[PDB]
Design an enzyme around this catalytic site. Sequence first.
Site, PDB file in Angstrom:
ATOM      1  CD  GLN B 252      54.681 -11.447 -69.081  1.00  0.00           C
ATOM      2  OE1 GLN B 252      55.287 -10.441 -68.707  1.00  0.00           O
ATOM      3  NE2 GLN B 252      54.724 -12.596 -68.411  1.00  0.00           N
ATOM      4  CG  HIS B 255      57.980 -14.877 -67.282  1.00  0.00           C
ATOM      5  ND1 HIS B 255      57.863 -13.612 -66.747  1.00  0.00           N
ATOM      6  CD2 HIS B 255      58.479 -15.659 -66.295  1.00  0.00           C
ATOM      7  CE1 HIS B 255      58.276 -13.626 -65.491  1.00  0.00           C
ATOM      8  NE2 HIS B 255      58.655 -14.857 -65.192  1.00  0.00           N
ATOM      9  CD  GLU B 316      55.988  -8.376 -63.924  1.00  0.00           C
ATOM     10  OE1 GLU B 316      55.486  -9.149 -64.772  1.00  0.00           O
ATOM     11  OE2 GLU B 316      56.994  -8.700 -63.249  1.00  0.00           O
ATOM     12  CG  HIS B 317      56.354  -5.835 -67.413  1.00  0.00           C
ATOM     13  ND1 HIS B 317      56.926  -7.059 -67.684  1.00  0.00           N
ATOM     14  CD2 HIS B 317      57.209  -5.197 -66.581  1.00  0.00           C
ATOM     15  CE1 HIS B 317      58.077  -7.155 -67.044  1.00  0.00           C
ATOM     16  NE2 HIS B 317      58.272  -6.037 -66.370  1.00  0.00           N
ATOM     17  CG  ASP B 350      62.400  -8.665 -68.563  1.00  0.00           C
ATOM     18  OD1 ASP B 350      61.668  -8.134 -67.702  1.00  0.00           O
ATOM     19  OD2 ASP B 350      61.980  -9.485 -69.408  1.00  0.00           O
ATOM     20  CG  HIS B 409      51.887   6.257 -22.259  1.00  0.00           C
ATOM     21  ND1 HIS B 409      51.813   4.964 -21.790  1.00  0.00           N
ATOM     22  CD2 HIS B 409      52.366   6.173 -23.522  1.00  0.00           C
ATOM     23  CE1 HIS B 409      52.218   4.131 -22.732  1.00  0.00           C
ATOM     24  NE2 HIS B 409      52.559   4.840 -23.793  1.00  0.00           N
TER      25      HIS B 409
HETATM   26 ZN   LIG Z   1      60.198 -10.260 -69.904  1.00  0.00          ZN
HETATM   27 ZN   LIG Z   2      54.147   5.023 -25.525  1.00  0.00          ZN
END
Ligand SMILES: [Zn+2]
Ligand SMILES: [Zn+2]
Lengths: 427, 427
Positions: B252, B255, B316-317, B350, B409
């Site tokens: 990681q 990267h 993320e991971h 990946d 309306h």
């Molecule tokens: Zn990776």
């Molecule tokens: Zn509307």
Amino acid sequence: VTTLRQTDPDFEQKFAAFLSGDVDRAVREIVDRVRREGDSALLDYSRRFDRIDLEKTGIAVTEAEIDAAFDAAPASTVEALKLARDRIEKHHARQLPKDDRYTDALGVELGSRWTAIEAVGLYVPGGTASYPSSVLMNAMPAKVAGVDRIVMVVPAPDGNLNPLVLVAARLAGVSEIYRVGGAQAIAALAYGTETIRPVAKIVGPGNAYVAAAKRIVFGTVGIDMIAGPSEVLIVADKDNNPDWIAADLLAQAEHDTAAQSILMTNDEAFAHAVEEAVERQLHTETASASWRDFGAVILVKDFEDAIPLANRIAAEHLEIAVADAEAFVPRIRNAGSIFIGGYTPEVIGDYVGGSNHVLPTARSARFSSGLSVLDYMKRTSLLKLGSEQLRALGPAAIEIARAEGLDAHAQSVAIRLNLLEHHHHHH
Amino acid sequence: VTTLRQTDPDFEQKFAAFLSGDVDRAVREIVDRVRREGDSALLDYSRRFDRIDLEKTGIAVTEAEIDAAFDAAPASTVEALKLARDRIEKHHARQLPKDDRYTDALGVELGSRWTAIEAVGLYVPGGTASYPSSVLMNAMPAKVAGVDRIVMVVPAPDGNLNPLVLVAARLAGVSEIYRVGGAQAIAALAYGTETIRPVAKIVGPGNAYVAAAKRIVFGTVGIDMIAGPSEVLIVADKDNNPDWIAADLLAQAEHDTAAQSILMTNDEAFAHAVEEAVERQLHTETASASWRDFGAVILVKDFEDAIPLANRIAAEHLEIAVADAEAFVPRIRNAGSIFIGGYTPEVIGDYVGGSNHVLPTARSARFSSGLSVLDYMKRTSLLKLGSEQLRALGPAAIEIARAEGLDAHAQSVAIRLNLLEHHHHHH
Ligand SMILES: [Zn+2]
Ligand SMILES: [Zn+2]
Ligand SMILES: [Zn+2]
Ligand SMILES: [Zn+2]
């Protein structure tokens, strides 16, 4: 009213032009100040823009203030809001995503799991633009999605709050309500202040300051979309009541001064009959300025012609009033919401249909959808490989990692395969 | 390596600080110029930043140039990319959304229909940051979703293109490839130029200029998310191979220089054993600068403690390597991707897992998901009311519209009910 004719040698040029179409610095400073200073900067900006002293009124609205709002509301209005809340809730519940975990042919275990966003903030304009229907439409899906903390920020210019907004807030599961707005409120939600704990996502259209603030904080918090001018596209043949079609065009116009209402038809006399109805009803303001300035009629020879034009317009709201309407629904791919037949005015979708009216504007139906429970949830991917699977897929990974110059990536697989391989010399 | 201990009276303050954490003007001008001038401004900016003369090389890459790329590629690399493409495709196909049309108790017809975005653009960094795996991961879901036109823009500094990027592009269904990058390429995709017809959405992380350009065009085109620094969180007990865990932390790190690798464990000796392995493998650059500058160890007494911390990190991971791992998966709600067990290094995701690695970064897993077919499609709401339904829901709509001061309306419903009511005097 503007009128374009598809056969015109210059139609394409005029249609394309018809489709076409600052405060950044000030907002950048407001956002940064609220982030760095907190509550004191919130109070500062609220004075300048809302002419209110939150030190005396308080930032948060109390349950007692919300109760008073309910009592002041006419019974039929509270009841109507509840029916709308119930319809919206039942509809959205059907859209909840289902998790998916499975094992493929190689034995790899793959998964898809959905969870609700923990805290969400709803931006609601203050003053005369403060609508309770907007509150139900924005908050109910978060409630259905399972959002633990739903926050609403709504400015109270000169200290005034629409009590119906407080009524709606409660009906839709809103937990906290704060009397702030503009770029300062967006900054407080994104970064947090002493009084307002930060949220993970902010939804709700606002003015230029709100829009600029949202572009800045995107990344720190998720954001729905940037509010753009609204538009309704009505595709109708002569077999309709001209007064009804006119009423629909005008309903969309009163919304905003830059709102746009378009009639696409294959019968010029009918278009004329609709324009005359629009004129009579116009008497018996914003709608007036809206219909004249942005209203338009597009004449085609038949509805096959209308399909590509409707797709390019990619309207937030599309009313289809032609014979065999169900046949055109699948052909018109870009539209936020499609209302079918003469008894389905767009207005119903704003309130009691159940479908979320907070839809994509300014051609954004080309790439986005209206608000749904998915906007208040997120998916997490799950992956599990056993030794066999890594042995089967690892070599390919190493090959690609090395071809990309990512040696550490290749090594995290190789270090495992190197030991594992001594148990696989038979094949 | 930085080490935080949950029991520390100052742990919370240090952990919160650990979690915390221009070109706008220049980009604003570049974007506006490309919009107003087209191809000539594209060529202008490409010279300044890529030192290339598109007038001579051409803006679009030819099929012949892509063919040459294939021949120059080692057979095993083309084969590996195909296996990855096939795994990604099969996985994403399972996630295609299903339409939903139904009739509720009142007889209202409600619908949900999905369509693919017509044209999408993929931004791929040029030079040494130009990865073929990124191309497959970004393009394949659009291909599975049914996107008609998939465009890729990839800068060719000093005229150089990674041939493996061209190989991947074809394998993933990319239709057009243009040798441009930066804010100028983002502007061309959003607004269009003589050579590059506009797209409806742009996906693919880029540098500060690309990120600033995307914030500007959001609204005109949809955009995935703003690229932020990547991070892996590894939650592991002592029953793991320290060298394996170290390899994962280092993978990681190589990267990006700002990438972050975190080990969360309940066994200090094990943490020490992992740090020693990280040191030895560090010999036998960006990973070095990355592990030292941003690496960290968080010590808890048990894994129940790790749950809230992991949720705040919202990585993320997330690699879960503890006994009874499957038990913690549902407890940790914020994570882009979860990799289970000792044989599932993040690296596999990946490339060959099939699950999209283009995941949310910088705590964005709190509100977003990794790329999926849904990001390349949009939902349209369908609504149809007959006279009975409008009679049943119209009054509520009128009540709310009038309470909101939206008379036009209210009238679009009233004009219909007023005529219809003469057939309902019996009830
Ligand atoms: Zn990776
Ligand atoms: Zn509307
Ligand atoms: Zn025709
Ligand atoms: Zn504990």
